[PDB]
Design an enzyme around this catalytic site. Sequence first.
Site, short mmCIF file in Angstrom:
data_model
loop_
_atom_site.label_atom_id
_atom_site.label_comp_id
_atom_site.label_asym_id
_atom_site.label_seq_id
_atom_site.Cartn_x
_atom_site.Cartn_y
_atom_site.Cartn_z
N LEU D 6 43.01 -8.77 26.30
CA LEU D 6 43.45 -8.46 24.92
C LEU D 6 42.79 -7.13 24.62
O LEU D 6 43.44 -6.56 23.88
CB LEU D 6 42.62 -9.60 24.15
N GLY D 7 41.54 -6.97 25.03
CA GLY D 7 40.89 -5.68 24.58
C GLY D 7 39.64 -5.35 25.65
O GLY D 7 39.26 -6.22 26.24
N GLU D 8 39.26 -4.11 25.68
CA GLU D 8 38.25 -3.49 26.69
C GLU D 8 36.91 -3.07 25.78
O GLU D 8 37.15 -2.57 24.87
CB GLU D 8 38.63 -2.60 27.38
N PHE D 11 30.06 -4.24 25.52
CA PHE D 11 29.38 -5.41 25.22
C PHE D 11 30.04 -6.65 25.85
O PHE D 11 29.26 -7.48 26.54
CB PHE D 11 29.09 -5.69 23.66
N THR D 13 34.21 -8.38 27.26
CA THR D 13 35.94 -8.07 27.11
C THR D 13 36.56 -9.08 26.77
O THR D 13 36.34 -10.50 27.07
CB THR D 13 36.07 -7.84 28.72
N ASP D 125 26.52 -7.78 8.57
CA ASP D 125 27.65 -6.70 8.43
C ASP D 125 28.74 -7.19 8.20
O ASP D 125 29.41 -8.04 9.02
CB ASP D 125 27.19 -5.70 9.69
#
Lengths: 117, 287, 48, 299, 69
Positions: D6-8, D11, D13, D125
């Site tokens: 899905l994404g790299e 912190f 994966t 945040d």
Amino acid sequence: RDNLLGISWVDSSWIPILNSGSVLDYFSERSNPFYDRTCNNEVVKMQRLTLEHLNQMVGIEYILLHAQEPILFIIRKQQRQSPAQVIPLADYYIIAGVIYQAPDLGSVINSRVLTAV
Amino acid sequence: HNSSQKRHWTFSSEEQLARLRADANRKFRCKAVANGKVLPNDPVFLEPHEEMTLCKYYEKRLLEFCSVFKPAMPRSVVGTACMYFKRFYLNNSVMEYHPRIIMLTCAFLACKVDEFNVSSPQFVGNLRESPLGQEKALEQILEYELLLIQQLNFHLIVHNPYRPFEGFLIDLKTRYPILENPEILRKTADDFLNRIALTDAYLLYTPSQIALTAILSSASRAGITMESYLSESLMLKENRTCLSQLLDIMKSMRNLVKKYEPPRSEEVAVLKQKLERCHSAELALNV
Amino acid sequence: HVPELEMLGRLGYLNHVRAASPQDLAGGYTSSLACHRALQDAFSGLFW
Amino acid sequence: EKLDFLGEGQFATVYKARDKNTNQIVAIKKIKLGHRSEAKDGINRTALREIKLLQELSHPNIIGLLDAFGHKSNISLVFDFMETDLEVIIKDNSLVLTPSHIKAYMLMTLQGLEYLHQHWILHRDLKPNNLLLDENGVLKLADFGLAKSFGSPNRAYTHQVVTRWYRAPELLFGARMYGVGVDMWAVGCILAELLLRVPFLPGDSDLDQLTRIFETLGTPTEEQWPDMCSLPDYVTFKSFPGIPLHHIFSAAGDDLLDLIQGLFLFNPCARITATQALKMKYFSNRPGPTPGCQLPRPN
Amino acid sequence: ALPPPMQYIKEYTDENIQEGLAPKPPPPIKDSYMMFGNQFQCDDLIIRPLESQGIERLHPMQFDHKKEL
């Protein structure tokens, strides 16, 4: 805000810079009482080189209807339910850099007859 | 707890906790019998009640370790470390894992969950060991921390009675001016909470009930009467029945405190020798 | 349930163990908020 | 089973992989840790905060940890699959104007914030980045690692956790304590950025964001925020006249502009609360917030 | 915006609604700064402002216009 039909708004400095898309822009300004600071027409002032914002998703918008190059520039206020669905709300016509609201047939006839009687 | 997410984990009866400790010890014994390294009912095998007595001595030792901790120690962190150790030991046999190493892992995790964030080298510095041994111990803590997270079932959050007790003391002062020396009552209530922390009553009851019991114990100790507070408590959901249920819990809690006794040093020394013998025997993991 | 604003004697008392600190007050730690935080945790559960 | 990446992320994966337990494809997040360091904290501190808070909160507007695996050295986290991040869609030129979709995003954020605030969790945040939109279109807060719980007894408090682009003035002034109002200020920055489609305030850190905040809203008066000078970190900027919200962002909603002004008030107590925002007239209006069924979906 | 084609008759005419002797007299010759239209148009000035103000001068003070042109 008493009667939108009985108000006229202009800006002599804007009058020299005037033709086609310029008209859409002048109307888009803000201080013009006819222009709403809410609705969708405010977010087209925020958007850039938009080319189809009135269709896919919808809302209150202002689009040029008929245009004569020197002075005449008619604007129409539409409320879209969906793409390919248009509902006309009102018409504001600009003559000689002077914006007026198009009077209704019945309302204009009745008020002027009342003045005559 | 209105937030909940720990209500399923909490066990209503002490007998249920004792049976769970027995099954965990039995499961390890069954695995050893399957290996065939040791015969069933082996002398080396440790009975669950004997293991519980060794844990109670270690729980007192953990309180001493928290007191001698080099950085200032939050009371909530001390409660979280004790809670983590008891639940990990409820899940797995006491003989399989040395209690002191697990307690160090629980204290490090407790600091991280409560945002104390004590440094791992600083924690190693507080411990006194050979420097090569300290590095090996730090590696053991990391492996145990992964096992502790699996035992926690990803439920790091803990409900601690100290925060409700502070709220109850403020509520008591505003609701009634009859009580006197409220700060001294708060100190005695905090001492009562520490006794409850040593007992398994912390797992048995919700933190708010434990905090209320501590305030009630302080009032009885000073001779102050909480009957007016009981009447306001009676005016709540379930009316009188809710107040009567709370009174029954208070009586059972007193019985748990009286039943609990400090572990005999001589019996603890025999248990420590037996625990060392269990560690001397090698499980050899899985082949 | 406990309200965020006590609107009661507790709000009138306006007293905390740490009392009031000007630097702390500007960032947060309103006296009503601190009293509410303790009360909500205290009132948590209390029923089966 | 790994089906897709899905994404790299350094912190952790993200993998678009069907769960072994469930045949349907699900979002999987796997923590990345290094054993090379002589001293290690084991599970990452930010990851530890994210997993516990996600388990604690069960809500439509809050992502939840359906299952997680600790048997492997790596930790695998199972979450509802999200089609795309909110930030990429906002930065992308909109094909049409979607003001009711913007209203829907804010309403979902406020409802999710109200649920965590009711649980007493505080989200340090909030930003368009690290925000995920599912095919359903429900808004969920992807990362709870930034979020830190706050308690009445004095305790160490994280500072500068909020993004430099969208940071509360008190955090810039290094106030010792933080409040629910700080989250509302971040929501106000997101709402202003959503109308613009670009970040409302540029933040380069080193008080650059604070200078921008002073320029947009003018200099705060001593009356507007109490003891601002008393705070140990205090900087006096030039006395900018300020820009009326309806000039920075052309929008001037009859009730939306009032809500934006309340969110941008310097005082946290003055700043509109999430509960007040739920009762705000702009949300309860003739334009109707999108359920997410009609929310634009890529491909 | 809000402004119309300028505010209509006010102030001096209100004063002027009197009789016989009551109206105020004419104002004095303000020999200083005024605001006609939008420009200040202050008094005491020359006709052709020197090119030295605002630009370089490439011509000497002899300035025999016919030769320099």
